[PDB]
């Protein structure tokens, strides 16, 4: 269980992302989670911050630091993951995460994770599964 019924939610299996307001969604979007080599965990993560013109930095699973200046970012925790809008990725659908192999988190459409930033609040829960 997480909070009142509001949260970001994803389904990697089904490569689809959501926002949830009212236990129902605010967002419905198609995504791509992280690559098979370094899979996404799915379960319960947390947007304790929603972002605008964020930058997805860090280090690759290889030890190769990176950046991805994102329009909208939810730096979620304890899992490494992070849901975000992805203007750089033109695909979302059936399993891209394996073929396109994008890092470890969920690559959400630029149009939706904005909405998100607009509905989710610092403290909203994040899910992928
Ligand atoms: C979505 O993919 C999201 C982030 N991508 C990555 C990623 O690893 O590329 C993660 S996991 C996160 C990345 N930064 C940490 C990490 O792996 N550090 C690391 C890894 C290997 C070696 C070193 C080192 O030598 O210091 C460090 C964990 C995350 C889902 C957004 C932000 O792009």
């Amino acid at each position: 269980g997480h909070m009142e019924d509001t949260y970001i939610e994803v389904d990697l299996e089904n490569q689809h992302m959501w926002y949830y307001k009212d236990g129902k969604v605010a967002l419905e979007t198609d995504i791509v989670s992280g690559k098979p080599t370094t899979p996404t965990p799915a379960g319960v993560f947390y947007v304790w911050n929603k972002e605008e013109d964020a930058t997805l930095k860090g280090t690759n699973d290889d030890g190769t630091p990176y950046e991805s200046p994102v329009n909208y970012w939810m730096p979620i925790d304890w899992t490494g993951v992070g849901i975000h809008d992805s203007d750089w990725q033109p695909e979302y659908g059936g399993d891209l995460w394996k073929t396109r192999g994008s890092h470890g988190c969920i690559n959400t459409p630029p149009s939706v994770m904005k909405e998100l930033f607009g509905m989710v609040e610092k403290g909203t829960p994040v899910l992928v599964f």
Side-chain angles (χ1 to χ4, degrees), residues 69-83:
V70 105
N71 295 263
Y72 296 86
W73 170 231
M74 316 297 194
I76 73 188
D77 212 277
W78 48 87
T79 53
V81 185
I83 280 72

Side-chain angles (χ1 to χ4, degrees), residues 33-34 38 40-41 55-68 70 73-76 79-84 88 102-107:
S33 224
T38 168
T40 227
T55 311
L56 277 40
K57 297 202 207 176
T59 324
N60 264 266
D61 270 79
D62 295 281
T64 75
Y66 64 102
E67 287 119 76
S68 336
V70 105
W73 170 231
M74 316 297 194
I76 73 188
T79 53
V81 185
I83 280 72
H84 63 77
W88 62 71
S102 45
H103 290 308
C105 62
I106 287 68
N107 282 211

Side-chain angles (χ1 to χ4, degrees), residues 81-92:
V81 185
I83 280 72
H84 63 77
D85 95 296
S86 176
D87 174 66
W88 62 71
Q89 147 161 82
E91 48 271 332
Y92 324 70

Side-chain angles (χ1 to χ4, degrees), residues 2-116:
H2 34 297
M3 255 222 306
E4 77 174 90
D5 306 280
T6 297
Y7 55 96
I8 341 304
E9 185 186 277
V10 199
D11 192 323
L12 314 325
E13 319 229 65
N14 295 263
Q15 289 296 329
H16 192 91
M17 197 228 52
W18 291 273
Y19 182 80
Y20 269 79
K21 199 71 94 173
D22 226 277
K24 70 168 299 198
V25 305
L27 237 49
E28 226 164 57
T29 219
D30 279 309
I31 42 87
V32 1
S33 224
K35 75 216 297 176
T37 74
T38 168
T40 227
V44 75
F45 320 144
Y46 217 61
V47 47
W48 51 280
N49 181 88
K50 9 69 77 173
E51 271 298 291
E52 283 186 305
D53 185 65
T55 311
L56 277 40
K57 297 202 207 176
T59 324
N60 264 266
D61 270 79
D62 295 281
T64 75
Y66 64 102
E67 287 119 76
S68 336
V70 105
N71 295 263
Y72 296 86
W73 170 231
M74 316 297 194
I76 73 188
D77 212 277
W78 48 87
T79 53
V81 185
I83 280 72
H84 63 77
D85 95 296
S86 176
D87 174 66
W88 62 71
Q89 147 161 82
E91 48 271 332
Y92 324 70
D95 297 86
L96 298 161
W97 61 273
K98 9 183 30 180
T99 87
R100 330 215 79 114
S102 45
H103 290 308
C105 62
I106 287 68
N107 282 211
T108 320
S111 309
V112 301
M113 250 267 342
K114 69 180 199 78
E115 301 268 269
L116 219 39

